[PDB]
Paper text:
Cytosolic purine 5´-nucleotidase (cN-II; EC 3.1.3.5) dephosphorylates purine nucleotide monophosphates with canonical activity towards inosine monophosphate (IMP). The cN-II protein assembles into functional homotetramers, with each subunit comprising 561 amino acid residues. The cN-II structure possesses the overall fold characteristic of the haloacid dehalogenase superfamily: an α/β Rossmann-like “core domain” and a smaller “cap domain. Whole-exome sequencing studies have recently revealed that somatic missense mutations in the gene encoding cN-II (NT5C2) are associated with relapsed acute lymphoblastic leukemia (ALL).
In this study, we describe the biochemical and structural behavior of the three most common mutants: R367Q, R238W, and L375F. Crystals of all three cN-II mutants belonged to the I222 space group with one molecule per asymmetric unit. Overall, the spatial arrangements of the mutants were almost identical to that of the wild type. The L375F mutation is located in alpha-helix 13 (amino acid residues 375–381), which interacts with a 3/10 helix (amino acid residues 485–487) in the neighboring subunit. Introduction of F375 induced a closer contact between the mutated residue and H486 of the adjacent subunit, which was accompanied by a slight displacement of the proximal L379 side chain. Consequently, this led to rearrangement of other surrounding interactions at the oligomeric interface; i.e., the NE1 atom of W382 formed a hydrogen bond with the carbonyl group of H486 in the mutant and with the D487 carbonyl in the wild type. Our data show that the L375F mutation causes local changes at intersubunit contacts. On the other hand, the R238W and L375F mutations stimulated catalytic activity in synergy with ATP binding and caused a decrease in protein thermostability. Interestingly, interface A also includes helix A (amino acid residues 355–365), which was well defined in all the mutant crystal structures. Helix A is formed only in the active state of the cN-II enzyme, and the stabilization of this region in the mutants is consistent with their high catalytic potency even in the absence of ATP.
Author numbering:
A (entry chain A), B (entry chain A), C (entry chain A), D (entry chain A): 3 to 402, 417 to 488
The structure:
Amino acid sequence: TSWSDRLQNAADMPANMDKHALKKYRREAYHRVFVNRSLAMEKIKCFGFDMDYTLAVYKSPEYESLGFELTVERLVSIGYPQELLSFAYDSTFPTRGLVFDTLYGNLLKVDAYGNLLVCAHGFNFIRGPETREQYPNKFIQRDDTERFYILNTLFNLPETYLLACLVDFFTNCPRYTSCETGFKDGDLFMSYRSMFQDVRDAVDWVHYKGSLKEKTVENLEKYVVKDGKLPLLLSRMKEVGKVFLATNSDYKYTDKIMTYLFDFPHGPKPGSSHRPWQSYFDLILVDARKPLFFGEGTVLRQVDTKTGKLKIGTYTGPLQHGIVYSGGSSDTICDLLGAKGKDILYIGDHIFGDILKSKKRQGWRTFLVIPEFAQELHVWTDKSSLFEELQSLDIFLAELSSIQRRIKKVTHDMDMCYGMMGSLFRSGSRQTLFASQVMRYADLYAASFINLLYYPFSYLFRAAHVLMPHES
Amino acid sequence: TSWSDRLQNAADMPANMDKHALKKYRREAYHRVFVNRSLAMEKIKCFGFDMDYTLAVYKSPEYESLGFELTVERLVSIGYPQELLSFAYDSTFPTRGLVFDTLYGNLLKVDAYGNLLVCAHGFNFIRGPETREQYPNKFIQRDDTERFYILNTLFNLPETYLLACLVDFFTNCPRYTSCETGFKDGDLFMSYRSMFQDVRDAVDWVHYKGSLKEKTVENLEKYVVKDGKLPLLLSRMKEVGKVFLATNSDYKYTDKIMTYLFDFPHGPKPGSSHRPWQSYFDLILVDARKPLFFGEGTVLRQVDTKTGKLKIGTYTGPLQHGIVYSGGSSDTICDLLGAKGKDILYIGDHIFGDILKSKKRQGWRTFLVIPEFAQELHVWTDKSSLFEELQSLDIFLAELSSIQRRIKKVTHDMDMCYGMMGSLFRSGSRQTLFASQVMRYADLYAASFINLLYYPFSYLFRAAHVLMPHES
Amino acid sequence: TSWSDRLQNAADMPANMDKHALKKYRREAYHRVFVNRSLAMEKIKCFGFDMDYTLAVYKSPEYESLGFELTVERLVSIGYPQELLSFAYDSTFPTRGLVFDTLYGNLLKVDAYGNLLVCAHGFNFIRGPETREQYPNKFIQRDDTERFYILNTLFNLPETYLLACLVDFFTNCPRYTSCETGFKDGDLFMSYRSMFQDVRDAVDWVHYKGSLKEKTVENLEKYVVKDGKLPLLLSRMKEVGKVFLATNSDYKYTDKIMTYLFDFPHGPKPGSSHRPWQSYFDLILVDARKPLFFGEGTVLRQVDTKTGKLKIGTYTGPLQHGIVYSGGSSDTICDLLGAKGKDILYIGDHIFGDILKSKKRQGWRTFLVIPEFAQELHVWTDKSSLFEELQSLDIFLAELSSIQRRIKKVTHDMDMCYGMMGSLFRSGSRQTLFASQVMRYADLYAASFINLLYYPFSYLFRAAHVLMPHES
Amino acid sequence: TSWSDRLQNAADMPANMDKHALKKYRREAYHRVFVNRSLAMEKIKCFGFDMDYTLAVYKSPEYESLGFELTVERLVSIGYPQELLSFAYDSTFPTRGLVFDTLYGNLLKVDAYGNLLVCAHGFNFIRGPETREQYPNKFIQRDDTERFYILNTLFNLPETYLLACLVDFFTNCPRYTSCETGFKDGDLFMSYRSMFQDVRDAVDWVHYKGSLKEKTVENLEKYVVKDGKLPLLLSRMKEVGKVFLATNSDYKYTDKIMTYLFDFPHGPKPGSSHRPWQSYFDLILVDARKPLFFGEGTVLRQVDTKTGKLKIGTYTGPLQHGIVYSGGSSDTICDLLGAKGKDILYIGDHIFGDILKSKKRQGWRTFLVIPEFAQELHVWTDKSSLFEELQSLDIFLAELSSIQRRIKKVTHDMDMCYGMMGSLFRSGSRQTLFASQVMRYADLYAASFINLLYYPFSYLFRAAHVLMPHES
């Protein structure tokens, strides 16, 4: 059972909007919205969305596997060895948020301070003392963006696995000699940095020039979660505020995906007339180019929705019914909707991108969708006895060895319940960079934004005030 | 009673090193070290220091007043009006960490998200609704460094006050017409941005070219806290690890100040032979140019300690006894002392500078000295009933107006106990940017690093593990 | 008769290598090599070439017309109006080296100092006094690269004409309102800058992603000049020095074009065995990325010549027979051939690019091919009586009005003999920027590098020494 | 007899303004204005000047020697060896326009293409073949500004000589070991790059913070050429156009120097009332910050001429009588004087700076003052038989060894007549970079702008039209 299986199981359920049923439902951890900073929903005047992995949650592991396969095919196409074609995506390996070290060809799981939690070279998980040879301080400077690439998006899951497969393959292929920084084949030297750049370029190519979108749209039921409660929640949002879409995707793809997402034999609820997806939005903006969107942005354009092409000219007019915009900036949204940043709840999955930038640059309120959380929460709740043991061990050690070996063992057994690279949010008792970023920049979070359906219009989401050590 | 009065009162006390006395002493909040992240002192192999406002804590408000007076004199010298000479420093106005908005000429106190807590234009504190005219979202983008300057150092206290004095003066002087972005005098327009740049340039000039250092060194008893326990703690550090100085100051000034700091008729303890200040350090580095120091740094040079001039040439040799270094980088320290970053505890007052950068760039452990904390902690403890009331009011409001007016009143009365710009760490129930940065980057903090004297050699400083909302 | 007709007529002639015949032939202006700086051919050890418009001279106006048509089709494809499809390339309009002013939508012909010689808005040639409204000093700052784009390559001929066609079209189309900086259609505004960027992007797309290369290679006889003397000259060069190819083109295209260029039923001369094009080169380098090539370059790669794909890895080996390189830098050539810059004669058409950069960055000797010179020289020689009259008029005016009107008339009549935008090299008595750049950076120049065939192995090309005014 | 002796001898002569006398006087090469591009004086509406080395020509070698001595004193002051104090300026060594190679510590004289003409390491002039070890292509990339510094101003004459003295000193001092890129003293290594940076910093310090200006103004007769014809020419300019000063110097220094320059017991001519220097200018601008001046410039300020300080505020008003401006941009001049660039003749000595930039950025007309030309022209005319022999030898060699040795000998003997580094304008038959830049960017040039006094109001300065080789 993948995280998207959990999402689809919940998607198949009809909405019981009886107030006591709703109160009962959001008691359950899987239907809750979690709160890092207090948020009075009555003050939200505009609800904004990203599309990919937010409105359109791609099914796992099918979609990752498709991306993986097409990326492999592209690399072979440009000259990588035929053996790559024998690789097959394995969802049990990657966790989101890993760092690829282009100098030494390692995948690293780090905390918020750049401390090493896990280090794998290909499929070889490197123990603590061997890690010191390459990382003397068990630390990386993660903003050395020439060396380190942080694989923070769900689109980066296939390349996370592909990188490890490639390191493994070249290491074990007798044609290549393994060196500290890459592989030697006579008078050719393939650095890990060049290999990474080829992988990155290929993934980009698959998305922008290859067949990924075409293969997705030709089998939307295989690849995209669909939930009849989606128009219900969007219609409710539109009763109390404005609703907008701001997506990096182009109009043609957006239209295909959104049409699918709303393709039911009814509108907001069973028995109601179906309505086009566009009617659920006060403002639709495609080709957003986030994160540049949250700064200078790009020229505001208008989509000719008959052809899917841009009209000639920068668009200088007002918000009008039926118009679809392209490019622009976050200020476009504010201006056209008459909103100030704190009046906006922006809903998306890109934590290091949309969510961080909308918060830091514009003071928008944020809701982070974490598609994998459906599965993570299962594991967290099922294995809470392991975590509790780990807490007790840390506490007992501190108050003053055999205890350290036990801590290592429990840490490993806990982490392996999530996958080879462990939980998105931690390794044992140590939080990841990703966990830290969610706490810092996501006002609210959940496995799906559909969980807002279970809270009333003017709910006050509450978090405890943070105190300094001397104030506590 | 200023914060430096508190520091000097504690400095005058002899050290009772009986273990039970030490345990009793660090119970008291004023002699504690506070802990944001756990730190096992037994793992620290090197103790590093900054000088200014760390080893050499300048007395308040005398030193700020001197800086203020010399900066005013410099501005008048370059053509500012003679009326500036009637200004007098007032320590009850500035709090450290305010943001000068060069567009509208306001001092702003913000939270970690750029939300406005306080806004003053000159000496006029602007209420919430009037704040919306210039800050529609009650928010600033604090990394818009062309517009906003964050006054984060204690050296910035006099200019914090001077900026407000200047805005007040020009506003009320009939020769000038007050405009949105500056002041008009016929065919001359002085923007707030140009005024700020003159102030910044003048403060820099006073420190680097003017008489501030000369006036300080000619009356060190007036201007610099002195504590006989300083050589005791440094000598104890040197029994268990290496000790280093890394200061932006030049050798000649460093030598004057450090000689004063060690000028007692004894060495580490009463009855022991006096020893030169240099003997307490395994490595002395001046002209550090932090924060560039924590990246590429500058060429490593050697000081001719007879002349106080640099020797000709980049220094390419090993650590040797009696050598004093100039420039270099954080890697110099690591290389010469044989240390990895987590083996180092770096002690300084510059949170946004040395402490943040040493942590983020190098994974050093950090101890933040906060000179004003001696006074802040007094006020915090004396007015804890006001804070507790504020907590109860927030809690009562949330569980569902007259209560809001009460919250505003209590917030104001609490804040005014600290000064006109309130606590370094908060306004009412809201934490400042500065508080957030201390929590994030200072592993340990206190009003003085001398508080380490009260903890044993291998003490384990403990902080609770942070949990995400769904983990709690 | 186009310039490429002249080149092909000369290409059809067999080579008479009798020394007296060769001496007679290079007497004629059309078969001469012209000399800006003295060059002793005996000191040249390496002859290097570009491919496009150097070895492979595209036929005119056919090739420009193809590029024009495909660029138009691309613009219509992305949403430009269908009326564009009625445009047809006109070779009598563009001259190479014009400046597009993206602010006001003008094509400008300038001198080396940025002084305006010609200004056309669409097809309206703007007289001197109307030019002052937009160019008060009849001057542009040509290095303001945000505003001005210099159309210096033969690939820029179709877009030169397309820009004028578009300005004309939008000006005369009643749907658009002509404004100073672009065109208004209700709530859409198309700036000249945005229009130019679309044109530039479309031309790039046609070359890199569209069908231009495919359409060229499917009818090479229509599109590419072919000369049996080419292998004769290259074989002679290889008797006295090394020969190299450095092209921005990819291997697959290079191979198609070069195979065509050498496809005769003989090798260097009639009666000799045919030899593959690769055998004429000591070093073949594709994907050169000039001008970056003349600085840091890119990673050196090796082409798998069976597949046309790159081999995996940076190539670290020596020059070997049959290897084809990709990327690298000008230092690659020097290292592998054992050459110093002044030992190299580099032959190309890109004056502002390859020729200027190889000279300035590396001190290479340069030979500039100017494909249009075959026609320009015809016109120059036929209309020399007009030029002589113009000289006499300038001289008579200076020694001290009706004469100015005559000067304007003769200038116009002369210029119109070349085309609507006049000579590549001048307007009347004033030299263009392009002329100045040829003099400054091309040691040698001619309509074809084949003219080197008519000079002996160790010929001394001589130019007069330049004297300052006080030295003369 | 120095070049400034020649200038002062001509300065001492009264002006005979009889038209036939003026015609006779400017026949002589020393009183001529030389012409690179034609210039109709009747079209000039504004005459602009720099001050230093233009209006105020510093006497040689006295002024260079003063600068040299103060720079040496500063280096010794910051820790250079006492032996530096024995150096003494020698005007026979430096020629302006040399390139310091910070990698290998050489002074280089180059042509316009970066080809090496002369190479000296300290005082050792390196012959051609030894030059190849460090410069394999006898070429430098002169825009590699990290490595090469071009000493283009007369203020750079003392440091030109100082650099050679320092290389010589360290080479011959037994304490230092000479290495390829600097000097080793045990564990100290002084690179040539660090040595150059110290020299550059010291020269800057002498001008901006040291005593150079003070020592100059206390003995203006020793240090500054003075000519009673200066107010005569400026007064004549003001009869036909506007006159402006744009100087990088501050007001206080400008006022001292200009007051001296006009301190005669008369005004424009003997017998006329003296008038203040300011009355000769329609616009006076100080603190110009050229070359930034010719782009964005700096904020326009107004000088309080009573105090010599800036008034508070950006100046937003019109041109008014008696105002003195500070900062601003070249557009300030155009706006306030109502001029377009080609209406302006700008007169200065900084060829690579003011003259090049005003021409390239703004299309101003240019007059280059070359103070050394007074002496260079003497040598040129006296040794023209050597140059003529050299021309004959080059010509005889070309038409086809003993002749090459003769060419080298004559080249050396000619060059040595000018000084150790030869003529500003050439080495033998090869022109320097400086010569090329004068031809390219100075419309007019002479040893002094006073030579304009000898041409009538509406003189047409004529230069021959440049033709390409195929046009000739």
